[PDB]
Amino acid sequence: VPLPEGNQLFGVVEQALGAGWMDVRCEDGKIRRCRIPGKLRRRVWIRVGDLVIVQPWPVQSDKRGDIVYRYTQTQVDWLLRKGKITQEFLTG
RNA sequence: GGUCGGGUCGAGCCUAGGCUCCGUGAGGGGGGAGAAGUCGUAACAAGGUAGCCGUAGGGGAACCUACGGCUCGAUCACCUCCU
Ligand SMILES: [Mg+2]
Ligand SMILES: [Mg+2]
Ligand SMILES: [Mg+2]
C-alpha cells in the first residue's frame, strides 16, 4: 500500500545471489545488485518475481540499492487496476 | 700584488656501465571474512569400500586407484602367548 517517496522506485526481482543479495530490475531500465536490510530479512521471505521498493545507495546510485518493502498480491493487483504501473513491467 | 712556466692536492660537473629504493601499472595467482546462490556427500558409528602416512598416475569438486607401512580400526569363529 505505501508508495515510493523521493528517489525510491519500483522493481522486479530477477535472481537471488546469496548472502542476502538480490538482482532487481527497476523502472528506469537498469539492473541493480541490491542489498536486503537485515531488519526485514529475518521475517519477510522474498522470491524471484515480486514488486518491491528500492532506494539506490547515495554513492554510485546506478548498480546498488536497498529493498525496503514487498508488495503482496492484493496490493499489486490494486496498483495494476489503478494504472500507476503497467503489466509488461511485471511480466518483462 | 699582476702575468707566464712547472709539480702536486682537490669539492663540483659530464658520459658510460653495474647494483638498489619510491610511485604508477595491462594481465595473472592463491589467502581471509560473509552466508536467504549452486553441484555433490569426502570424514565422525563397521559413517555404509576401516581411516591415515610416503611416492606415482587419473578425475567438475570434495576425491579414486597401485606398491610398501602404522593402529590413532568395529564384529564373529578358530589359534598363540601371559597373569
Ligand atoms: Mg561417506
Ligand atoms: Mg568411508
Ligand atoms: Mg581410475
Task: Describe the overall structure.
This is part of a larger assembly, with one chain. With 92 residues, this protein is α+β, with helices and mostly antiparallel strands. The protein has one domain (1-92). It is built from three helices and five strands; from the N terminus they run βββαββαα. It has helices at residues 38-41, 73-82, 87-91, and strands at 11-16, 21-26, 31-35, 52-56, 64-70. A five-stranded mixed beta sheet has the order 1-2-3-5-4, with no helix packed on it. Strand 2 and strand 3 (31-35) form a beta hairpin. The radius of gyration is 12 Å and the shape is globular. The two termini are 22 Å apart. Bound molecules: magnesium ion (MG) (3 copies). The protein binds one RNA strand of 83 nucleotides through loops. It is classed as translation. Keywords: small ribosomal subunit, translation. The entry is titled "Cryo-EM structure of a Pyrococcus abyssi 30S bound to Met-initiator tRNA, mRNA, aIF1A and aIF5B". The protein is Translation initiation factor 1A. Organism: Pyrococcus abyssi GE5.
Secondary-structure map with pairings?
Layout: E1 11-16, E2 21-26, E3 31-35, H1 38-41, E4 52-56, E5 64-70, H2 73-82, H3 87-91
Parallel strand pairs: 3-5
Antiparallel strand pairs: 1-2, 2-3, 4-5
The structure holds one RNA strand of 83 nucleotides.
* Domain module tally: 1
Count, helices: 3
Bound molecules: magnesium ion
Q: What class would the helix/strand composition place it in?
A: alpha+beta
**Going across the major beta sheet, what is the strand order?**
1-2-3-5-4
Could you tell me the radius of gyration in angstroms?
A: 12 Å
Large-scale geometry = globular
Q: List the helices and strands in order.
A: EEEHEEHH
Count of β-strands:
5
In terms of DSSP E residues, the strand content is 25-35%
- Between the first and last Cα atoms, what is the distance in angstroms? 22 Å
Estimate the helix proportion, in percent. Answer: 10-25%
Oligomer: part of a larger assembly
Largest sheet: 5 strands, mixed
Family: Belongs to the eIF-1A family.
Organism: Pyrococcus abyssi (strain GE5 / Orsay)
Keywords: Initiation factor, Protein biosynthesis
GO molecular function: RNA binding; translation initiation factor activity
